[PDB]
Amino acid sequence: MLEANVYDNFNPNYYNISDFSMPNGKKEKRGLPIPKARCQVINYELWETGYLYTSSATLTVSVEVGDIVQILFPEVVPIEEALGKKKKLNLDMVYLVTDVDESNKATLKNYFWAMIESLDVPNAITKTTNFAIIDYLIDPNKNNLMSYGYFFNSSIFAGKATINRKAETSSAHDVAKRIFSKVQFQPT
Amino acid sequence: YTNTSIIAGGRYFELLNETVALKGDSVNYIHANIDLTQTANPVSLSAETANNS
Amino acid sequence: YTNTSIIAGGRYFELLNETVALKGDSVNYIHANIDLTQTANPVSLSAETANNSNGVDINNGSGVLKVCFDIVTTSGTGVTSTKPIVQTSTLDSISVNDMTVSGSI
Amino acid sequence: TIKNFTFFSPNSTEFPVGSNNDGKLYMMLTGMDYRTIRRKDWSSPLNTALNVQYTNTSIIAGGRYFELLNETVALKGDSVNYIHANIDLTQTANPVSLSAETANNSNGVDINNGSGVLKVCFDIVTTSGTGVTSTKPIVQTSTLDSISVNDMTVSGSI
Amino acid sequence: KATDDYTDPPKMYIAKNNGDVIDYSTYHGDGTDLPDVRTAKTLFYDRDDHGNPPELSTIKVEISPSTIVTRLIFNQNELLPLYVNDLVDIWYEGKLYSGYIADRVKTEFNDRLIFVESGDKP
Amino acid sequence: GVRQYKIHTNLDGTDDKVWDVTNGKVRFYQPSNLGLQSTNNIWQSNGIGVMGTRSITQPQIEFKLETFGESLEENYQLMKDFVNDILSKKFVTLEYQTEIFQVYADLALADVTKTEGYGKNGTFSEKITFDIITKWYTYENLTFDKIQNGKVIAGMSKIYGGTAPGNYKYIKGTSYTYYGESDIDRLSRWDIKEEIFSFMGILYPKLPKTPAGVRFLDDIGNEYTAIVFKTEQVQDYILINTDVNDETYQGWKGTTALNLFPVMDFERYRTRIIEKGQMELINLSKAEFKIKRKADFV
Amino acid sequence: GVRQYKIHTNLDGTDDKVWDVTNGKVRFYQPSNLGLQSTNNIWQSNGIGVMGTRSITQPQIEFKLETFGESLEENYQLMKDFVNDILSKKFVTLEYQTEIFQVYADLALADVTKTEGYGKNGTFSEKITFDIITKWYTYENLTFDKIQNGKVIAGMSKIYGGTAPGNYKYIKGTSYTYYGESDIDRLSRWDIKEEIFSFMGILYPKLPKTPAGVRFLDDIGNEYTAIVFKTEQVQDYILINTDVNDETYQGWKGTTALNLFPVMDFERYRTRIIEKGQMELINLSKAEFKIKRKADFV
Ligand SMILES: [Sr+2]
Ligand SMILES: [Sr+2]
């Protein structure tokens, strides 16, 4: 089986407050909590990015809608954040619980797509580079879910943004899909 | 490694026709691993995703 | 409680290496509970969600006396702060030479 | 573990209460520490040259009660003596002993919980070459958390 | 006005637990007075004839909470019978709910009632 | 020695006709299953087993019902009298009795058969099937416990004795152990040791217009449920029954039975399930309780 | 010689009541199936067969449960005792013992029967069905291994001996081989040779406030999982159980048991399944381990 860390909703109305006293002295944003329960995931279908289908899993503990599920793997992923710099990143599959049935089978939605929900973006923002759109989309002050900054490969998002149809107001989902298709990348 | 000598932690050993399998489209960090409890084979080589010295 | 003495309803008892389990991310109200019918173990401790002190007269009548003596605040991992409950002295008339007040009169 | 005391024992063995257990109880009731005392002179102490005889004086030091019945204390010539109550629990026959010292040597040793000898000053005796000149008693400190009172009278200050 | 476009950055408005709508930037609390979950929405506005930004109260209406009312469908108790159009206060699993008996279902087996809470609690 | 089965019309009630099915004219023989079935919800991923929650299912009980009449008239009269007595009451209580135990089941009549294959003097061999409401529950008598004052002993207790003006000595182990309490007769514990579901408590109130009923306390001295009634006049006794199937509340005065449900405190009565702790009497001079707690397999 | 079946209420626990179902009063006979079933997911394209992943499914074991009492009273007393002991614990451990092996199963009560067909002195012959949680796992004591210094030999070892000022010769094959290591008592390997699923370790910690607990190393000397706790005071022993059904992480100090779940490092504890390599003790003076490892068919 796979190990799961169940946390309550990463409410940005709570965690987006710089009142945490750091050991040096200065104030930083509230850190993520400890899992309310450590459980194990059985009878699962887990998607890495959630480009086409939504994930599903039957969890041992009785999770509820809103809770964040962190699926753990005993392996490490090396991500190149700077030209030469690489960092030891532990393998994770982070989802938001959308619905739980009678048999405790939880419908899991990939954290990113559940974060950029209901967010609309005008044509004015699509005029600049792809970096400007990513910097707009990922913001814990606007988002439904908490985020402590993105990690991005400059070379792939260096290019000029794709031209919008009718130069209208598009949703964060439609623009991300349009951008991720041209750049040939998906978020994790 | 056809004929490579290594000194790690003051311990001398030779790699004589010793093949290390690599990960594709990746930067492989080749490590010498010394475990003294493994009496018969104390040294082994690994190809890793990071420098884990 | 490594070595704490308590007087509740005029009854003296000692807490010697007595551990009370707490609720995480909560304000725990620590109570001393006295049940005289429990002849072998009349006193027990509890960690509760509210101050549930009941003022039950155990020296004149029946019932369980519950009295809060400590307030222990937790995070998800451990204790963040502890505040004791005030010890009230109710007196009729006082004759004194000198007094020091740290709070207010 | 919870050690119960002010509770009846049906088999007469369940809840025995000792000297230290009651000692701790008395300290909490009056609101005193190991640095202060509870002292009352039922009859004024007599002064005979460089000696002080306590006719009838009751003292509660570290929650332990004892009476001084015509107990004479030797004094130092032309010096400000400090009368101390010394409690050594190892001396099963005579735990309390008195001493007139040069300075206030109140140690505040926890005798009811741990080991040691408790020293605490209760009376200051100022003497000359011949006899006692003046006597001043040590203030009885009453440490309390909150007071609900009707009327009060202060002779010193607040 | 100058670009006739939405060139300027957005202003985020949060509705507190009491109901007061404030700018998110103006917030100085600990999160206890804010909702446990954040359901967001993006709104577009056109500047008035005077040119002034849209009023706070007008935004408030588009971000207001709806009347959450609990409906209890239960079997008829012969110890205390309840009928259609009766003003009632029901105790269910330690919680008190207040409202009226809206309907009654006559079946061959049982007799049931629908309880509708009228709300207006605080 | 041998097993005794008994069918009861209204167990815990006054109008309880008892049918001795082991001994009497109508007999229950060869029970189908007296055991139990359980569905544990065990799902296994990669050979390792995870267990869910076990729903402890009870199977129907089918008895070989034989009649022992003297004539065809007598056997027909038994079948008609027995089966209709089971139909008159919404549920019929069975009693499983042996040398070691006495348990009860609340069966509901599922199926009874009537055929024309008569043995000698029109005797019957038929199968009677029952549906289970509650399978195995004890019907124990619950009573309060009294607290007694410890004996006074010289040197061991707290007294100022011997030579005037009295003396009590502190000793290691012996010291002063208090004798008891002045008016210890004021302490009475109605102890609850195991979790109960239903109970038939008769309660006699003391004062009229003062809330009368029983309250329940947990292990920490906090109240969870209380059956509290308010009355205008003193009802000689309040006859409360917590059984779900035939819940009964009634204040008896003389020969008149009054329903006390609308006059009961709805806020205080939070649950029917009684937890480990104690029970306190509110405005009650006397009480007689009959406790009925579960047993899955016996 | 012959096979031994034993039922354990709580294997790996102090409160372990053992029922000898081979020798004792309550006996298990004729197991339904001790084998296994597998679903291989074989899909075929144009006559050629492609095989997926084999889900090894374990079937219910049904035993012919017999009682050996001396009276009707004793046989009823066995059925009540044996079945309730199985119900008291959420899951029961079977012990399949033979001349060659000693395997264990984690069973859950599926169905038990009680009938009135009594043999002699109220004898019982009933069928007991069990649901499989984990089938066949070895329960063994895991201990560390010690390394000892090799003997010193003249000419073979690195020493300057014989005629002054000492001489060591380079030979072909025999040459110089080091004897051992100074303080070879520091080297201790906790060896993991086969993949293990759960374990019951009693950890003895050294320093307070320093993360104390075990970590697991793979074959290349890297860490995959670690159960590490950071306590405020020195626990006399940390008890850790990796069993899925009843996980225990308690720090005992004296007679007091403390829950160590919130103090644990959630990020380091990546998996429960231990792989081939070695175990390292972080801030530990002594360690005592019991390793359980699964076997599909035995
Ligand atoms: Sr009845
Ligand atoms: Sr166990």
Side-chain angles (χ1 to χ4, degrees):
Chain A
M1 81 267 276
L2 260 46
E3 291 305 288
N5 281 337
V6 184
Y7 309 91
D8 250 280
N9 189 251
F10 297 157
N11 185 34
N13 302 351
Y14 188 86
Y15 295 93
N16 193 46
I17 295 165
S18 300
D19 75 315
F20 168 85
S21 195
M22 290 261 281
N24 74 306
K26 101 110 168 179
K27 296 281 180 173
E28 277 282 15
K29 291 186 181 184
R30 289 171 180 169
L32 292 173
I34 55 99
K36 60 171 183 171
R38 160 66 71 116
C39 80
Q40 35 281 342
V41 34
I42 53 96
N43 190 266
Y44 63 91
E45 183 191 81
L46 303 172
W47 292 96
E48 205 148 300
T49 62
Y51 160 84
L52 209 76
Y53 307 95
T54 51
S55 299
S56 79
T58 314
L59 302 137
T60 60
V61 75
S62 62
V63 306
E64 64 173 73
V65 182
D67 301 354
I68 318 298
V69 179
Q70 180 201 24
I71 289 123
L72 316 162
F73 294 84
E75 52 182 324
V76 282
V77 168
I79 64 99
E80 210 159 18
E81 61 179 314
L83 191 274
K85 214 235 181 189
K86 262 189 177 183
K87 64 151 250 291
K88 284 261 65 52
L89 188 272
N90 288 298
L91 185 61
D92 252 2
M93 281 192 174
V94 181
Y95 306 99
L96 164 97
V97 178
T98 50
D99 190 51
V100 176
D101 67 352
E102 319 82 51
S103 54
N104 207 78
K105 184 196 173 180
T107 316
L108 300 163
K109 188 180 184 175
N110 297 71
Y111 202 93
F112 173 84
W113 305 98
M115 184 185 70
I116 63 149
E117 270 190 311
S118 309
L119 186 76
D120 292 290
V121 53
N123 191 66
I125 303 170
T126 71
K127 285 188 179 167
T128 46
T129 56
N130 293 302
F131 162 69
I133 305 134
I134 294 298
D135 198 50
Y136 168 80
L137 259 69
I138 297 91
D139 179 52
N141 302 269
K142 294 187 288 287
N143 296 332
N144 305 268
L145 291 156
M146 194 67 202
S147 54
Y148 301 91
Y150 58 87
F151 294 165
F152 115 35
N153 186 301
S154 299
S155 69
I156 56 167
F157 300 103
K160 205 270 165 200
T162 46
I163 59 155
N164 257 35
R165 48 129 69 182
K166 298 166 278 180
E168 284 185 315
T169 290
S170 312
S171 61
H173 166 78
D174 295 35
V175 295
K177 259 225 288 177
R178 208 182 81 260
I179 287 155
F180 296 141
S181 296
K182 202 78 181 177
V183 303
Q184 299 183 247
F185 206 88
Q186 285 294 313
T188 37
Chain B
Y1 292 95
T2 56
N3 187 2
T4 296
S5 292
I6 298 166
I7 303 163
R11 311 304 188 97
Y12 177 90
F13 57 94
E14 298 173 353
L15 309 176
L16 307 169
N17 294 142
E18 182 64 18
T19 303
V20 183
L22 311 167
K23 183 178 177 178
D25 243 66
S26 296
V27 177
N28 299 84
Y29 294 85
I30 318 301
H31 294 73
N33 308 295
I34 304 170
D35 184 353
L36 303 177
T37 68
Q38 297 297 293
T39 273
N41 307 274
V43 184
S44 65
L45 305 182
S46 62
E48 305 183 22
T49 61
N51 185 330
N52 298 311
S53 302
Chain C
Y1 292 95
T2 56
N3 187 3
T4 296
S5 291
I6 298 166
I7 302 163
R11 311 302 188 97
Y12 178 90
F13 57 94
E14 298 172 354
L15 309 176
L16 308 169
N17 294 142
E18 183 64 19
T19 303
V20 181
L22 312 167
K23 183 179 177 179
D25 245 62
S26 294
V27 178
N28 299 85
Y29 294 85
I30 318 301
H31 295 73
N33 308 294
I34 304 171
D35 185 353
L36 303 178
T37 68
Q38 294 299 290
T39 270
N41 305 275
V43 184
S44 66
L45 305 183
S46 61
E48 305 183 22
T49 60
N51 185 330
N52 298 312
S53 302
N54 63 15
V56 167
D57 186 340
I58 58 158
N59 297 309
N60 289 305
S62 59
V64 178
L65 170 61
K66 297 181 65 64
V67 65
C68 182
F69 69 90
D70 241 1
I71 306 165
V72 183
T73 305
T74 60
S75 62
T77 65
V79 179
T80 61
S81 69
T82 308
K83 184 184 177 187
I85 290 289
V86 175
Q87 295 172 51
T88 306
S89 293
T90 306
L91 311 169
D92 192 358
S93 183
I94 302 170
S95 177
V96 71
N97 299 317
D98 300 273
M99 175 176 63
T100 307
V101 178
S102 64
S104 291
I105 305 166
Chain D
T1 58
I2 304 164
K3 272 204 173 187
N4 311 122
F5 297 100
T6 327
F7 302 91
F8 78 111
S9 310
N11 297 290
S12 300
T13 47
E14 292 90 325
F15 312 108
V17 51
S19 60
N20 63 304
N21 307 120
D22 259 4
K24 280 180 264 177
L25 156 80
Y26 299 136
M27 280 178 72
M28 292 163 73
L29 296 155
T30 192
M32 66 171 276
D33 56 25
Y34 294 96
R35 303 203 170 273
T36 190
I37 69 294
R38 291 293 170 271
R39 185 257 194 101
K40 176 65 190 175
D41 292 270
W42 310 104
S43 57
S44 295
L46 299 165
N47 303 303
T48 309
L50 290 163
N51 292 288
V52 54
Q53 188 202 78
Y54 293 93
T55 51
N56 187 17
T57 310
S58 298
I59 306 164
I60 312 162
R64 310 295 194 107
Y65 179 82
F66 57 91
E67 287 179 19
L68 304 176
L69 299 157
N70 296 91
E71 184 59 76
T72 322
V73 177
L75 297 157
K76 189 187 172 185
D78 200 77
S79 182
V80 182
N81 289 280
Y82 289 86
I83 326 296
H84 290 89
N86 313 312
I87 308 164
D88 187 26
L89 303 160
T90 65
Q91 322 295 292
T92 54
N94 297 268
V96 184
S97 57
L98 296 170
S99 59
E101 292 162 66
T102 53
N104 197 311
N105 304 293
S106 296
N107 56 32
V109 167
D110 197 324
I111 54 154
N112 298 294
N113 298 285
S115 61
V117 189
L118 176 63
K119 294 180 77 67
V120 57
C121 193
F122 62 95
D123 216 44
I124 324 145
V125 180
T126 309
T127 54
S128 59
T130 55
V132 182
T133 51
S134 59
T135 187
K136 184 188 176 182
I138 293 286
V139 287
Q140 302 172 63
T141 316
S142 300
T143 316
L144 296 153
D145 208 323
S146 184
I147 304 165
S148 180
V149 66
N150 289 289
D151 296 272
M152 209 187 204
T153 307
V154 180
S155 61
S157 282
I158 303 163
Chain E
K1 281 281 182 179
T3 67
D4 192 58
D5 200 22
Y6 290 101
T7 52
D8 290 300
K11 270 192 173 184
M12 279 53 72
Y13 299 97
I14 192 156
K16 289 184 176 184
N17 285 137
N18 51 33
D20 300 316
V21 178
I22 58 135
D23 193 308
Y24 193 75
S25 58
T26 61
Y27 188 75
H28 47 272
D30 61 326
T32 54
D33 54 292
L34 290 183
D36 29 69
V37 283
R38 185 198 285 183
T39 51
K41 67 182 290 186
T42 311
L43 287 165
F44 300 111
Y45 282 121
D46 285 338
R47 299 192 87 100
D48 58 58
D49 309 348
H50 304 261
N52 290 23
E55 196 182 1
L56 176 273
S57 69
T58 61
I59 283 168
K60 182 168 185 177
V61 181
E62 212 76 40
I63 194 195
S64 297
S66 55
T67 51
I68 318 107
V69 150
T70 334
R71 258 198 283 102
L72 305 165
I73 317 106
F74 57 90
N75 292 314
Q76 182 81 274
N77 197 340
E78 57 184 68
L79 288 149
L80 209 151
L82 306 166
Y83 319 101
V84 161
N85 302 317
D86 287 341
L87 294 169
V88 280
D89 286 357
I90 274 114
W91 274 106
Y92 181 66
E93 296 294 304
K95 307 180 201 74
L96 181 68
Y97 311 93
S98 296
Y100 75 106
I101 304 296
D103 217 335
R104 184 167 160 194
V105 63
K106 291 262 188 177
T107 62
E108 292 174 320
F109 302 106
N110 256 114
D111 219 293
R112 285 169 69 89
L113 295 310
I114 302 176
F115 170 76
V116 180
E117 186 175 30
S118 208
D120 216 60
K121 201 171 188 181
Chain F
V2 206
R3 161 279 304 167
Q4 281 298 318
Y5 284 141
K6 286 172 194 67
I7 277 299
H8 296 238
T9 44
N10 188 34
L11 189 269
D12 80 42
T14 57
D15 51 75
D16 189 46
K17 188 192 178 175
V18 190
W19 286 82
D20 197 341
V21 279
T22 291
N23 283 309
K25 297 271 192 176
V26 92
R27 294 188 214 181
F28 278 9
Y29 288 119
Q30 283 171 276
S32 63
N33 199 19
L34 295 166
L36 39 76
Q37 307 147 330
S38 177
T39 168
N40 308 273
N41 312 318
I42 306 153
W43 187 257
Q44 298 177 63
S45 60
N46 196 80
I48 64 247
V50 172
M51 187 193 162
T53 50
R54 60 164 180 88
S55 0
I56 185 73
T57 323
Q58 297 289 15
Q60 284 182 314
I61 307 165
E62 185 200 272
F63 293 99
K64 226 175 216 70
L65 164 121
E66 267 85 71
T67 65
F68 294 87
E70 304 163 18
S71 58
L72 241 181
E73 188 171 6
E74 199 169 328
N75 286 283
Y76 269 118
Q77 192 60 61
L78 291 163
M79 279 283 277
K80 191 184 172 182
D81 287 328
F82 178 69
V83 182
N84 293 331
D85 283 2
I86 297 165
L87 300 163
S88 64
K89 303 289 193 297
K90 67 171 285 175
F91 77 101
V92 160
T93 313
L94 175 66
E95 170 192 298
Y96 192 22
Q97 193 180 16
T98 53
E99 300 170 80
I100 55 159
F101 63 74
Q102 191 182 346
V103 283
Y104 304 90
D106 284 340
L107 308 168
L109 192 277
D111 172 61
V112 73
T113 58
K114 193 168 184 167
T115 58
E116 284 189 352
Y118 307 118
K120 297 202 191 172
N121 307 109
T123 213
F124 281 79
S125 180
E126 303 297 332
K127 281 168 180 175
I128 187 166
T129 325
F130 286 101
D131 270 323
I132 320 167
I133 291 155
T134 297
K135 212 235 211 80
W136 320 132
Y137 74 95
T138 69
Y139 192 78
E140 294 163 311
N141 191 7
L142 199 277
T143 324
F144 72 102
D145 305 62
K146 211 80 198 66
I147 317 300
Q148 288 183 322
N149 258 10
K151 304 166 178 72
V152 193
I153 288 98
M156 290 202 79
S157 304
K158 194 183 195 167
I159 51 279
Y160 302 96
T163 55
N167 68 336
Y168 75 93
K169 328 242 185 62
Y170 285 88
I171 332 105
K172 189 87 191 304
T174 44
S175 195
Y176 76 94
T177 55
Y178 298 99
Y179 85 106
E181 289 191 16
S182 57
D183 192 48
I184 196 92
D185 201 62
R186 84 186 194 271
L187 297 141
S188 55
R189 157 173 273 266
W190 287 86
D191 210 329
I192 300 150
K193 290 174 173 64
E194 306 280 57
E195 184 201 274
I196 321 114
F197 55 92
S198 43
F199 56 98
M200 195 258 183
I202 297 163
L203 44 144
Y204 316 81
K206 251 175 177 172
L207 295 153
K209 303 170 191 70
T210 311
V214 292
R215 74 183 199 120
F216 294 88
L217 295 168
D218 59 13
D219 50 339
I220 57 170
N222 275 304
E223 185 199 307
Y224 52 82
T225 193
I227 329 295
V228 169
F229 300 92
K230 62 156 191 173
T231 55
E232 288 74 25
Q233 285 101 65
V234 253
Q235 308 276 73
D236 321 341
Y237 63 95
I238 306 170
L239 195 104
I240 60 73
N241 183 339
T242 61
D243 151 318
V244 312
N245 293 299
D246 75 340
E247 194 177 6
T248 280
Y249 303 104
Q250 60 194 22
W252 286 78
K253 198 185 183 74
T255 53
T256 317
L258 301 174
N259 174 43
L260 293 187
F261 187 83
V263 89
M264 198 220 296
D265 197 311
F266 303 100
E267 178 179 339
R268 295 189 79 178
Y269 188 173
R270 228 199 64 90
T271 192
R272 189 167 285 104
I273 303 300
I274 310 304
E275 297 302 333
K276 300 185 181 195
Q278 68 175 311
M279 184 189 73
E280 285 198 350
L281 313 171
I282 320 162
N283 190 39
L284 301 171
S285 58
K286 183 190 175 186
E288 316 172 322
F289 275 83
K290 283 282 189 178
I291 275 302
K292 61 194 188 173
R293 48 208 188 192
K294 239 221 169 191
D296 293 280
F297 183 90
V298 159
Chain G
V2 205
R3 164 280 303 167
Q4 292 289 311
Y5 281 143
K6 285 168 191 68
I7 286 297
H8 303 263
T9 54
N10 186 41
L11 222 190
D12 79 43
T14 54
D15 53 76
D16 191 27
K17 188 178 184 178
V18 192
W19 285 83
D20 205 325
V21 288
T22 307
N23 292 311
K25 296 272 192 179
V26 121
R27 287 187 215 173
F28 277 5
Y29 287 117
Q30 282 172 276
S32 63
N33 199 20
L34 296 164
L36 40 76
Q37 308 145 333
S38 177
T39 168
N40 307 275
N41 313 317
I42 304 153
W43 107 272
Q44 295 177 62
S45 181
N46 198 78
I48 321 126
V50 174
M51 187 192 161
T53 50
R54 58 232 242 93
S55 1
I56 297 95
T57 313
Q58 298 290 15
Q60 289 184 337
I61 316 172
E62 185 199 274
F63 290 97
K64 226 175 216 70
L65 168 72
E66 255 83 300
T67 65
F68 294 87
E70 302 163 18
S71 53
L72 241 181
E73 184 167 328
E74 189 179 26
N75 287 286
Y76 268 118
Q77 193 58 70
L78 289 157
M79 283 288 283
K80 190 184 174 178
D81 283 20
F82 184 64
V83 182
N84 293 331
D85 286 355
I86 296 164
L87 300 164
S88 64
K89 304 289 193 298
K90 69 169 286 174
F91 77 100
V92 167
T93 308
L94 179 59
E95 179 199 299
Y96 190 14
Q97 196 172 44
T98 52
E99 298 170 81
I100 55 158
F101 63 76
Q102 197 191 350
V103 285
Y104 302 89
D106 286 332
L107 303 168
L109 203 281
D111 172 60
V112 74
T113 58
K114 191 170 179 163
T115 58
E116 285 188 348
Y118 309 119
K120 281 194 181 183
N121 305 300
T123 254
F124 272 88
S125 183
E126 311 295 323
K127 281 169 181 176
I128 187 166
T129 314
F130 284 100
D131 278 315
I132 307 286
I133 297 152
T134 296
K135 206 200 216 164
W136 321 129
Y137 72 83
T138 73
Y139 192 88
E140 293 195 64
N141 203 41
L142 198 213
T143 325
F144 70 101
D145 309 339
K146 211 79 198 68
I147 318 299
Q148 288 186 320
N149 271 347
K151 296 178 183 72
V152 191
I153 305 149
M156 289 221 83
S157 301
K158 194 183 191 165
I159 46 139
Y160 302 95
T163 55
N167 68 91
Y168 81 90
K169 329 231 188 66
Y170 285 87
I171 322 143
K172 198 79 154 281
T174 44
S175 190
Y176 82 88
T177 60
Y178 299 96
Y179 83 106
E181 291 200 0
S182 62
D183 195 63
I184 205 152
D185 201 62
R186 67 194 146 91
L187 280 313
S188 56
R189 158 170 270 265
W190 282 92
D191 212 330
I192 303 148
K193 291 191 141 64
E194 306 280 57
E195 184 199 275
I196 87 95
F197 76 128
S198 47
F199 55 99
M200 193 260 184
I202 300 130
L203 311 160
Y204 297 104
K206 250 178 177 174
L207 298 151
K209 302 169 190 69
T210 314
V214 289
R215 75 183 200 120
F216 297 90
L217 293 184
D218 57 12
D219 49 339
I220 57 170
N222 274 305
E223 181 196 308
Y224 50 83
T225 192
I227 333 293
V228 89
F229 315 95
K230 53 170 192 160
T231 56
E232 277 69 272
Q233 297 274 292
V234 218
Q235 300 304 303
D236 300 319
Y237 66 95
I238 295 169
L239 188 182
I240 76 171
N241 190 345
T242 306
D243 188 56
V244 314
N245 298 318
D246 81 339
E247 299 191 63
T248 291
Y249 304 103
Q250 64 190 23
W252 285 81
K253 194 185 182 75
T255 53
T256 327
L258 300 164
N259 173 44
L260 294 186
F261 186 84
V263 121
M264 197 205 294
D265 194 320
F266 305 95
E267 291 305 313
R268 293 190 77 185
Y269 188 173
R270 229 114 190 99
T271 196
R272 186 163 286 106
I273 301 301
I274 314 303
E275 298 301 332
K276 301 184 181 196
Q278 70 163 305
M279 182 184 74
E280 283 197 353
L281 320 164
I282 320 153
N283 186 34
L284 299 165
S285 55
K286 188 190 173 183
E288 289 180 62
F289 277 82
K290 285 281 194 180
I291 260 178
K292 52 220 273 176
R293 192 161 64 257
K294 216 191 98 285
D296 294 280
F297 184 91
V298 158

